Amino acid sequence: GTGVLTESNKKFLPFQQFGRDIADTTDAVRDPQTLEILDITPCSFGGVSVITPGTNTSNQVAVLYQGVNCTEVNVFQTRAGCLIGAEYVNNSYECDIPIGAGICASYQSIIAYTMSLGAENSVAYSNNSIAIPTNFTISVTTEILPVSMTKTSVDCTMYICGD
Amino acid sequence: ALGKLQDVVNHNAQALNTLVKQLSSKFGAISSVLNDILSRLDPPEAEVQIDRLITGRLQSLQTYVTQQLIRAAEIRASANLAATKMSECVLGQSKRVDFCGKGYHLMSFPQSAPHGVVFLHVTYVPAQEKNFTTAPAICHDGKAHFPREGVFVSNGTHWFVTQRNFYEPQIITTDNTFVSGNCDVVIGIVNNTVYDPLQPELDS
Amino acid sequence: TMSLGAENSVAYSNNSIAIPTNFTISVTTEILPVSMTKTSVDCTMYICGDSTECSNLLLQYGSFCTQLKRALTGIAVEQDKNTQEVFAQVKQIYKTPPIKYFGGFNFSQILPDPSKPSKRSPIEDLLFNKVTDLICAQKFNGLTVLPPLLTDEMIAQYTSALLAGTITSGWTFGAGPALQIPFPMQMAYRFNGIGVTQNVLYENQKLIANQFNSAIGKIQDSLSSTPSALGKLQDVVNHNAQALNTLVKQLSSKFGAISSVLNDILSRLDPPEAEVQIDRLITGRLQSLQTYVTQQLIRAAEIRASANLAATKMSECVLGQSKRVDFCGKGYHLMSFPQSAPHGVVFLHVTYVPAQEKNFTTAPAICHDGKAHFPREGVFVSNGTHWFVTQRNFYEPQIITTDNTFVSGNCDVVIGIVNNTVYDP
Numbered sequence: 036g037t038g039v040l041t042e043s044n045k046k047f048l049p050f051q052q053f054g055r056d057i058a059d060t061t062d063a064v065r066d067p068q069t070l071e072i073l074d075i076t077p078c079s080f081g082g083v084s085v086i087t088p089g090t091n092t093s094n095q096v097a098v099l100y101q102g103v104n105c106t107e108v109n110v111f112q113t114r115a116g117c118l119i120g121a122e123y124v125n126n127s128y129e130c131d132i133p134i135g136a137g138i139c140a141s142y143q144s145i146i147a148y149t150m151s152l153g154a155e156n157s158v159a160y161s162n163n164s165i166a167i168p169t170n171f172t173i174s175v176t177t178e179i180l181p182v183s184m185t186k187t188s189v190d191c192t193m194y195i196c197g198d
Numbered sequence: 199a200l201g202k203l204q205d206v207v208n209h210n211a212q213a214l215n216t217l218v219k220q221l222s223s224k225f226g227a228i229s230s231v232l233n234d235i236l237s238r239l240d241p242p243e244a245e246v247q248i249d250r251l252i253t254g255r256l257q258s259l260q261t262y263v264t265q266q267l268i269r270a271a272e273i274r275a276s277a278n279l280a281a282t283k284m285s286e287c288v289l290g291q292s293k294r295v296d297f298c299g300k301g302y303h304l305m306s307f308p309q310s311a312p313h314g315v316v317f318l319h320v321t322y323v324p325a326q327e328k329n330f331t332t333a334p335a336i337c338h339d340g341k342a343h344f345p346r347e348g349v350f351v352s353n354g355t356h357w358f359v360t361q362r363n364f365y366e367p368q369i370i371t372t373d374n375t376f377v378s379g380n381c382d383v384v385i386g387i388v389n390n391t392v393y394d395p396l397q398p399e400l401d402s
Numbered sequence: 403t404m405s406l407g408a409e410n411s412v413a414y415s416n417n418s419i420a421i422p423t424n425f426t427i428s429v430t431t432e433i434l435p436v437s438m439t440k441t442s443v444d445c446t447m448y449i450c451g452d453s454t455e456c457s458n459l460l461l462q463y464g465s466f467c468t469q470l471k472r473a474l475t476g477i478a479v480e481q482d483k484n485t486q487e488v489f490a491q492v493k494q495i496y497k498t499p500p501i502k503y504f505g506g507f508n509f510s511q512i513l514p515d516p517s518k519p520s521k522r523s524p525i526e527d528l529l530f531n532k533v534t535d536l537i538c539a540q541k542f543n544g545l546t547v548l549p550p551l552l553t554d555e556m557i558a559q560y561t562s563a564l565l566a567g568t569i570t571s572g573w574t575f576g577a578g579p580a581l582q583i584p585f586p587m588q589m590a591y592r593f594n595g596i597g598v599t600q601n602v603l604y605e606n607q608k609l610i611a612n613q614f615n616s617a618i619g620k621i622q623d624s625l626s627s628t629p630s631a632l633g634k635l636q637d638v639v640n641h642n643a644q645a646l647n648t649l650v651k652q653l654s655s656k657f658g659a660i661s662s663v664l665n666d667i668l669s670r671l672d673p674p675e676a677e678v679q680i681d682r683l684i685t686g687r688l689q690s691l692q693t694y695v696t697q698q699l700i701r702a703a704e705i706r707a708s709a710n711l712a713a714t715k716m717s718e719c720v721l722g723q724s725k726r727v728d729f730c731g732k733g734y735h736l737m738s739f740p741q742s743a744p745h746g747v748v749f750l751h752v753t754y755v756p757a758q759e760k761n762f763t764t765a766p767a768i769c770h771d772g773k774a775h776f777p778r779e780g781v782f783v784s785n786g787t788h789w790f791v792t793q794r795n796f797y798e799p800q801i802i803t804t805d806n807t808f809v810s811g812n813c814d815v816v817i818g819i820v821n822n823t824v825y826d827p
C-alpha cells in the first residue's frame with residue numbers, strides 16, 4: 036500500500052497481524068520485526084478548486100485544497116479546507132463565490148469572509164403599539180420557469196454501428 | 199436573468215456532445231473506427247473488437263438516456279409548477295404567500311420564452327408605515343366594542359378605526375363596530391366614546 | 403384483517419346542525435428533509451488509486467469520469483440551493499424584544515436559548531441530539547464529503563429571524579416591511595382568518611394561551627419520548643452513509659478477476675493478461691460508480707421535491723395563514739413555527755380544532771312579515787323554543803335582528819323556512 040504509519044493505541048491479540056475498518060479497509064498493522072502496532076493512515080489528498088472572478092475583471096486566483104489541513108500542503112484554514120491566495124477579512128458581506136462552512140470569497144485582491152445572512156432589524160414590539168401602512172408600492176417581479184426541453188431521437192443501430 | 203432556461207439548453211447540447219464524444223473512445227479496443235476493425239482483422243477477433251466497441255457505446259447511450267429521463271422528470275415537475283402558476287396567478291388572484299411574487303398578489307402576466315415561461319407578478323407592497331397606539335376593544339356604556347373589519351388606532355389623543363393594510367382613520371361608530379360582552383373580560387380594553395348615527399336624527 | 407377505523411355514524415337529518423361550543427389549540431409536528439450530504443468522487447483515485455497503468459487503460463473509456471464529477475457537482479450545488487430556498491427567505495434578521503411577554507403565550511421552547519453556546523432552541527437542540535471509522539474509510543478511498551455552505555448556527559439564525567418576524571409582526575414581514583402588532587391582536591386576526599370572531603379570542607385569551615403552552619410542552623415531550631419521530635431525516639443520513647459504504651465495499655470485489663488488488667495483479671501476471679484483469683476491475687468499479695451516481699441523482703430529485711415542499715410550507719404556513727386544508731396541520735390552521743433540524747426543517751403547526759359540539763335545530767331562513775330573512779354571516783339555530791343566529795365555528799347565540807340578517811324574497815320559495823320574529827333596533 037501507501038500511507039503514513041502513526042503510533043497506535045489499539046491492543047492487538049497475539050495471533051492477529053493486520054487490522055480492518057468497518058468498511059473492510061486496512062487501518063492497522065503489526066510490524067513483523069518488532070511486535071508493535073501501527074495505525075496505517077493514507078496520505079493526504081484533496082480536491083484542488085480554483086476561485087476566480089471573471090477574466091474580464093481580473094486574472095488573480097485563489098486555490099482551495101478541500102479537506103487538506105494547511106500544514107500538509109495569504110494562507111487561511113477553513114473547515115472546507117486550506118485556502119491559499121485570499122486574505123481573511125473580519126467584515127461580513129453577501130456571498131459572491133461560495134467556499135463552504137459559512138465562508139465566501141469575493142474580489143474587491145481576493146478576500147475571504149464569513150457571509151452575512153442579512154441586515155439586522157429589530158422590530159419595535161410592544162403590547163399596545165401597531166404599525167399601519169400609509170402608502171403602497173406596486174411591484175412587478177419576474178419568475179422564470181423552464182417548461183420543455185429539446186426533443187431528441189437517437190438511431191440506436193446507426194449510432195452504435197453505422198453502416 | 200435568464201440563466202435557468204439557457205442552463206437547460208446548455209445541458210442538452212452538452213449531453214449530445216458527450217454522446218458524440220463517446221464515439222471517439224476505443225473502450226479497450228485496437229481502434230475506435232469500425233471500418234478499420236473490419237478492414238484489418240479476421241472475423242474471430244474482429245467480433246471481439248466490435249463487441250468491445252458495442253458494449254462501450256451501448257453503455258454510453260444508456261447513460262445518456264438515463265440522464266435524459268432524470269432531466270425529463272425535473273422539467274416535468276417545473277412544467278407542472280408553471281401550469282399551476284398560470285392557473286392560480288394569471289387566471290385568478292392567489293392568497294398563497296410567495297406563490298405569485300413577493301408581496302400581496304394582485305395579478306400576473308404570462309410571457310413566452312425559449313423553452314419556458316416568464317411570469318410578471320404584479321403585487322401590492324405596503325410602504326411608509328406609521329406607529330399608532332392600539333387597543334383590542336373600546337369600552338362604551340359598560341359594553342365592549344370590537345371592529346367589524348378594521349383595527350383600533352390612536353394618534354395620541356383620539357381613537358379611530360382603520361383598515362389593517364392601509365391607514366384610513368374613521369370615527370368609531372356602531373356601524374363599524376360590534377358589541378360582545380361587557381368591559382370586564384377583555385384584557386387591554388380602553389375607554390372611548392362610540393358615536394351613534396341615529397342620535398342627531400332623533401335629536402333634530 | 404386490519405381494521406380501517408372506528409365506526410362512526412353521523413346523525414344526519416334534514417333540520418339539525420352540530421355547532422362547536424369549545425376549542426382546542428393543537429400543535430402538530432411536520433418533519434421535512436431539505437438537503438443531503440454533498441459528495442465528491444475522484445474517479446481516477448477511486449477506480450485506479452496509485453496505478454499509472456490502470457489510469458492509462460481508464461483513459462480509453464472517454465469522458466465517463468467527467469460526467470460523474472459533473473453530476474455530483476450539480477447535486478452538491480443543488481443541496482445548497484435547497485437550503486437557501488427553504489431557510490433564506492428573509493433579507494432582514496429580525497430579533498425578539500428583550501421582555502418576552504406576548505400576552506400569556508410562551509415561546510421559550512422555540513426561541514433561541516442565550517445560555518447555550520449554539521444559540522439553538524430547546525426543541526432544535528433536542529432535534530440535533532436525536533438525529534445522528536466510517537467517515538475515515540469513506541475519505542481514504544477518494545470520496546470526499548463537502549461541508550454545507552450554510553452552517554447549523556446560520557440556519558438556526560435564519561429560523562430565529564423567521565420566528566421573530568412571525569411573532570412580533572405576524573404575516574406582515576413576509577409580504578413587505580415588518581409591521582409590529584401585539585400578539586393577542588395578531589392571534590385575533592388569525593381567528594378572523596378561520597372564520598371566528600375577535601371576541602372569542604379576546605374573551606378566552608388566557609385559556610388559549612394555556613392551551614398553546616401545554617401543546618408546545620407536549621410537542622417537546624413527544625419528540626423526546628418517541629424514537630421514530632425523526633425517522634425521515636435519519637433515513638436520509640442512513641441512506642447516504644450506506645451508499646458510500648457500498649461503494650467502498652465495491653473496491654473489495656474481484657469482478658471476475660483473480661484479485662481485487664491492482665498491485666498483486668501487476669506483480670503476478672504478464673501485461674497481456676494483466677491488462678485484461680485491470681480492464682475487468684475498471685469496468686466493475688466504473689459500473690459501481692455509475693450506479694452510485696444514478697441513485698444519488700434519483701435521491702437528489704426526491705430531496706429537491708421535498709425541499710420545494712418545505713419552502714412552500716415555509717412561505718404559506720410560517721409567513722402567512724393558509725386556508726388550504728391539511729397543508730399546515732390537521733385542523734383550521736392558525737400559524738406555524740420553523741425549527742432547524744439536521745438536513746431538514748420541522749414545522750410546528752398551531753391549528754384550531756373545534757370541540758364539545760352540541761346539537762341544535764336549524765332552518766335555512768326565518769319568515770317574518772311575509773319576508774324571508776337569511777343570515778349575513780352565521781346560521782340559524784334553535785335550542786328547542788327560541789331561535790338565534792350564531793357563527794358557524796363557535797356557539798354564540800344572538801337575537802335575530804335586521805342588523806345580522808338580510809331579506810331576499812318572500813316565504814313561499816325557500817324549503818324549510820320557519821316562522822319567527824325578527825327584532826328591529
Ligand SMILES: *[C@@H]1O[C@H](CO)[C@@H](O[C@@H]2O[C@H](CO)[C@@H](O)[C@H](O)[C@H]2NC(C)=O)[C@H](O)[C@H]1NC(C)=O
Nearest residue numbers: 168169170171172173174324325326327328365
Ligand atoms: C405615496 O407615495 C407616492 C410615490 O409612490 C407619492 O407620490 C409622489 O408624490 C411626490 C410629491 O407629491 C411627487 O414628487 C412624486 O413624483 C410622486 N411619485 C409618484 C410615483 O407619483 C405620494 O405622494 C405618497 N402619498 C402619501 C400620502 O404619502
Ligand SMILES: *[C@@H]1O[C@H](CO)[C@@H](O[C@@H]2O[C@H](CO)[C@@H](O)[C@H](O)[C@H]2NC(C)=O)[C@H](O)[C@H]1NC(C)=O
Nearest residue numbers: 157158159160164166167326327328329330582
Ligand atoms: C415606532 O416607534 C419605535 C420606538 O419608538 C421606533 O423604533 C426606533 O427606530 C429608530 C430608527 O429606526 C431607532 O433608532 C430606535 O432605536 C428604535 N427604538 C426602538 C425602541 O426600537 C420605530 O422606528 C417607530 N416606527 C416608525 C414607523 O416610525
Ligand SMILES: *[C@@H]1O[C@H](CO)[C@@H](O[C@@H]2O[C@H](CO)[C@@H](O)[C@H](O)[C@H]2NC(C)=O)[C@H](O)[C@H]1NC(C)=O
Nearest residue numbers: 330351352353354355356357358366367368369
Ligand atoms: C389626532 O387626530 C385628530 C383628528 O384628525 C386631531 O384632531 C384635529 O386636530 C386638528 C389640528 O389641530 C384640529 O384643527 C381639529 O379641530 C382636530 N379635530 C378634532 C375633532 O378635535 C388630533 O389633533 C390628532 N392628535 C395628534 C396628537 O396628532
Ligand SMILES: *[C@@H]1O[C@H](CO)[C@@H](O[C@@H]2O[C@H](CO)[C@@H](O)[C@H](O)[C@H]2NC(C)=O)[C@H](O)[C@H]1NC(C)=O
Nearest residue numbers: 336337338339340341381382386387388389390
Ligand atoms: C373606564 O370607565 C369605567 C366606568 O366609567 C371606569 O370605572 C370606574 O372607575 C372609578 C375609579 O377607578 C370607580 O370609582 C368607578 O366605580 C368605576 N365604575 C365602574 C362602572 O366600574 C374605569 O376606571 C375607566 N378606565 C380608565 C382606564 O379610565
Ligand SMILES: *[C@@H]1O[C@H](CO)[C@@H](O[C@@H]2O[C@H](CO)[C@@H](O)[C@H](O)[C@H]2NC(C)=O)[C@H](O)[C@H]1NC(C)=O
Nearest residue numbers: 411412413414418419420421758759760761762
Ligand atoms: C345529536 O343527536 C343525535 C340523535 O338525537 C345523537 O346521535 C346519537 O348518539 C348516540 C351516542 O353517540 C347513539 O347511541 C345514538 O344511536 C345516536 N342516534 C342517532 C339517530 O344517530 C348525537 O350524538 C347528538 N349529538 C350531540 C353532539 O349530542
Ligand SMILES: *[C@@H]1O[C@H](CO)[C@@H](O[C@@H]2O[C@H](CO)[C@@H](O)[C@H](O)[C@H]2NC(C)=O)[C@H](O)[C@H]1NC(C)=O
Nearest residue numbers: 423424425426427608609610612613616757758
Ligand atoms: C372549554 O374547554 C376548556 C378546556 O380546554 C375548559 O377549561 C377548563 O375549565 C374547567 C372548569 O372551568 C377547569 O377545571 C379546567 O382546569 C379548565 N382547563 C383548562 C385547560 O383551562 C373550559 O371551561 C371549556 N369551556 C366551556 C364553555 O365549556
Ligand SMILES: *[C@@H]1O[C@H](CO)[C@@H](O[C@@H]2O[C@H](CO)[C@@H](O)[C@H](O)[C@H]2NC(C)=O)[C@H](O)[C@H]1NC(C)=O
Nearest residue numbers: 502503504506507508509510511524615618619
Ligand atoms: C415559559 O415556559 C418556560 C418553560 O416551559 C418556563 O420555565 C419554567 O419555569 C418553572 C417555574 O418558574 C420552572 O420550574 C421550570 O424549571 C422552568 N423550565 C425551564 C425550561 O426554564 C417559564 O416560567 C414560562 N414563563 C415565562 C414567563 O417565561
Ligand SMILES: *[C@@H]1O[C@H](CO)[C@@H](O[C@@H]2O[C@H](CO)[C@@H](O)[C@H](O)[C@H]2NC(C)=O)[C@H](O)[C@H]1NC(C)=O
Nearest residue numbers: 762783784785786787788789790798799800801
Ligand atoms: C333557549 O334559550 C333561551 C335564551 O337563553 C331561553 O330563554 C330564557 O330561559 C331562562 C331560563 O328559563 C329564563 O329565565 C329567561 O327569561 C328566558 N329568556 C327569554 C327571552 O325568554 C330558553 O329557555 C331556552 N330554551 C330551552 C328549551 O333551553
Ligand SMILES: *[C@@H]1O[C@H](CO)[C@@H](O[C@@H]2O[C@H](CO)[C@@H](O)[C@H](O)[C@H]2NC(C)=O)[C@H](O)[C@H]1NC(C)=O
Nearest residue numbers: 768769770771772773813814818819820821822
Ligand atoms: C307562518 O306564518 C304565516 C302567516 O301567519 C302562515 O300563513 C297562513 O296560514 C294560515 C293557515 O294555513 C292561512 O289561513 C293564512 O292565509 C296564511 N297567511 C299567509 C299570509 O300566507 C303560515 O302557515 C305559518 N307557517 C307555519 C309553519 O306556522
Ligand SMILES: *[C@@H]1O[C@H](CO)[C@@H](O)[C@H](O)[C@H]1NC(C)=O
Nearest residue numbers: 049065066067068069070071
Ligand atoms: C526479529 O529480529 C530481531 C533483530 O534484532 C531479533 O532480535 C528478534 O529475536 C526477532 N524475532 C522476533 C520475534 O522479534
Ligand SMILES: *[C@@H]1O[C@H](CO)[C@@H](O)[C@H](O)[C@H]1NC(C)=O
Nearest residue numbers: 161162163385386387501505
Ligand atoms: C403593557 O406593558 C406595560 C409595561 O411594559 C404595562 O404598563 C401595561 O399595563 C401593559 N398593557 C397591557 C394591555 O397589558
Ligand SMILES: *[C@@H]1O[C@H](CO)[C@@H](O)[C@H](O)[C@H]1NC(C)=O
Nearest residue numbers: 415416417766816817818819
Ligand atoms: C324533514 O324530514 C322529515 C322526516 O324525514 C319530514 O317530516 C320534514 O317535513 C322534512 N323537512 C324538510 C324541510 O324537508
